[PDB]
Amino acid sequence: AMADMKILRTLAGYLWMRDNPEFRFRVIAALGFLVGAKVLNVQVPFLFKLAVDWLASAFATPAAVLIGYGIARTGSSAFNELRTAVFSKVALRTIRSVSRKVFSHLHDLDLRYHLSRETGGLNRIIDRGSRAINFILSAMVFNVVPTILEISMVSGILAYKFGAAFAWITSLSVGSYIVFTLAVTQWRTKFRKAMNKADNDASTRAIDSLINYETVKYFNNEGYEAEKYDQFLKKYEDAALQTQRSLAFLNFGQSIIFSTALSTAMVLCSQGIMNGQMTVGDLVMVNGLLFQLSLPLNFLGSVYRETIQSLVDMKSMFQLLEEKSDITNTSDAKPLVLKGGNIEFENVHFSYLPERKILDGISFVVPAGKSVAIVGTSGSGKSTILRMLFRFFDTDSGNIRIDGQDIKEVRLDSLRSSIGVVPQDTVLFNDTIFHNIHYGRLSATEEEVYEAARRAAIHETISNFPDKYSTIVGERGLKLSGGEKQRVALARTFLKSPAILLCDEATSALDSTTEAEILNALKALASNRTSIFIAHRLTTAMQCDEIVVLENGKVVEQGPHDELLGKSGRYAQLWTQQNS
Template sequence: MLPPKTANALRNMVSAETRDTVSRLFMTDGRRHWKGYTLSFLFMGIMAGTTSGLAYLMGTVINRIFVEQNSSAIWILSGAVVLLSLVKGFSAYGQAVTLARVGNRIVADNQKKVLDRLLSQDVAFFTRSHTAEIMMRFNTGAQAARNVLNLIITSLGRDLLSVIGLTAVMIIQDPFMAGIGLVVMPIAVVGVRSLIRKVQKIFSREFHTAIQIMTESIEAFQGIRTIKSFTMEDDQRTRIYERIDRLEKASNRMIRAQSQSGPLMEALGGVAIGLVVMYAGWGVLHGGRTPGEFFSVITALLLSYEPAKRLARLNIDLTTHLLGARMLFDLLDRPPVEVDAPGTPALRVEGGKIEFDDVFFGYRADEPVLRGLSFIAEPGRTTALVGPSGGGKSTVMSLLERFYEIESGTIAIDGQKITEVTRRSLRQAIGFVSQDVFLFSGSVRDNIAAGRPSATEEEIVAAAKAAHAHDFITGFKDGYNSRVGEHGAELSGGQRQRIAIARAFLKDAPILLLDEATAALDSESEAEVQKALYELQRNRTTLVIAHRLQTVINADRICVVEKGRVVESGRHDELITKRGRYFTFHQLQFAGQQERLSA
């Protein structure tokens, strides 16, 4: 029984936040894997029992063999030591494997839950959060849950049971000597109390610095072309080096804080052993006690030293994992955003008529992007959105796919409000090709098949041919199995665009969104891509964003978007005749082209 002051100190060491986190871990992952933890705990109990048995047996070994010089005891006691050691070894193997399997399952389960929760967030969440922070939560949080549970289970099952069993041996052999040994634990517990807050602060700073290093490193690697083009290597190196040096200093402070409990335990352990030796030695020489009792207590005391030291610093070790576990729960507690209400119907696309009616929207409060935007994209026709940058053209496409929710107004497809149908059916009805093509780091085939994962090889090849991509794909050494590199870095801009168009062909959606799909291409590549786009637009409701008016002259309807509104609309010739905003853009653009041609 611990003294009241020591018990209070133990309770104060464990903050409410820590208790809540640990309790939640046991009520979720711990409860789900209770069978595995029970089996592991059983193995650790056997280990503690055999360890205590070996310590107790040392007294008998000394007395029967070395004091009484009993020959037959040699074989019996040696066999008992071997048997206990074998049982301990097998138990150690069993608990290690069982605990590892349970821990790996917890990591896998939590990573799946984190992934599910991340995929249920909207695009706005990912624009606010850096990839590095998300990945730290994804990996560190899942592993922290396992580490906290494993640390507590091993502390209770292996260390605490070992200390209890070895203490029992000391009490049986000599209660007074046991009392001397037990002085160490309460003093050690109180001694490490002051270290906990210090470790928590250092680890928090260390963790956030690690996120900054990962953030800047990822940006440096992804922006390597820009860095080299602007000769920014030295600046990047200096900034990241400073972060790394800061993390190194924080890590060193963490090690110093965590290691301060070691000398305390070493000193207290040495004092306890010295006192036991003094008392036991006097008792053997002058008090009629047997050497076996002395050696048994010393063995138990020495064997209990390491588990007692681990128990004393348990809260310090937990601190480094609890922050990661809390980050995991912070993410898992985020309510899913993209969840459709039960019974929400799927979108039924008959013609593909798109209607924006008095739509207001802004990415930030009091900064509107769309200010009552209204237009109609007729089914099976091509509608182009043109106008100055920042007018809200790309926002229209993001809202149509419900990446963001409008503030007021309505968006409808074939008379169905997109807010009243499932997001999945809405997005399945839309194909999208932009100038900023994203390709996954797999093969050409994988990236085309992303449009419809169940597609056959013949359908994938047909889509590539329709996108005018088959010829250059078969020119690669590995053909459709060729790797595209990270973000398609091993392909040219025109090749990436045509693979994206092939993906849209394979999806075969009735509605097509084209966001500056040829803006970044040279004339030759643009001609090839434009051929593919004309094929793709056939018999589809197509919404096109273009800054180069030449690419939308043949559109069925052109809407001029300016300051979040459609200021005029019509066919190319009609708008030229009106001599309004479209005419002004046209004159400016084609006048510039004429000047370049003259030069």
């Protein structure tokens, strides 16, 4: 309950944004436009009644009255239609601002929220909530107050010409109506939540199946996905069908309470034909007044039903907005200043889950201007150090140091800009290859981009393409070949030119002859700055000065290439079979 109150308060603050004085003029103009129509709408029946009465008692004068009636009809519609134009602008501006803020916060969220997300549920929630905000903004300003005022006016009219029992009857009817409506809305709130949960799951299942299109084409199991989607759609079918019947119960209950209220009103007055109310003029008055109470009352019931209905969909975003990143910067942060690349590890211990410990007692030092290569079993978690060094996941009980400085103390913005890393799996934007290669540094010019491709051994291949530097790379970089996709990612790091180089499985999908050229380029440019290369191939680690072997989360042997081969350790066995 109090969570919804915070949601309404936050939305209300957006409407009354103090920064823009134009919005203040815009909102008050629409309100005055509504009250002007409401006053004129009341005046219209009075003008018509006066003309009819005057004509009955009795030409230019009726014509002017009929002309004035013409503008009155035009004026009532003119005020209403001209009112919604302004509020539409302010509501749409609020929609855009809220969507942009949600987008920014979603990208601000931590990595642990990702890698386990429901792809599709996020966009479905965003669309559903963005559709919901417009109605809540539109209805709240113009509908709640005038209807209550009209209800109060009609209540005062009915209080006039006291019947000494009609007030009690209508109070009881109103109380019963409110109780019934609140109970029905509270019951129906549960059904919408069940339907919403099923809809997101089907969408994310469909999107996952679409992502697995290559696998479901390689394997003949195509009907299984259709069957699962049919089951999810059947669940959504049942959830939606339950809601529709519940709506019919509310509508039937809506009429039955008013129908018996009208019946008991006519019965009560007919019971007093003699020794009581004897004027038949009052008989039509009570019927007309009750209808005049019914129409605004029915409008109020729809407004609350739609508001509580639309507010349920709103809880989906704002729960996501309350999510906070686990990793946060220190209250006092020092900018990262380094004159050389030195990395030190002091008994780092880290675990993805409390049950299993991946890293245990790993300690190594990276001298400035030197390259260190780590090799080992694929299950040893060698790449976890590279991910942890980038501070994707914070350390538990270990000390990590760069140039004699605390990485945790150092600001994240400064930390994530001095070093550059080549991803193990290359992902490319669905945009031009020129944009993909220029994403490394937007300040770079065309000459810098072209020379970077030459050292990546890709400019010659690009020159032979039908569209030089303009081919459209497909979704997730599927259109380009594996090797060329690998070369593109390396070119981004080359253009970025970071202080510390961290390549992860660089020469995996690359032929032998091109790898020799790439390694020579690395050993010339990266002489003055430290780098760390990780790869199972023995040829890339041979050139490195220092080689260590990591297995089962603990370092085994350290030293240069010559010492490792002589020691006849784990490294020697790996190189022996590779040479063959």
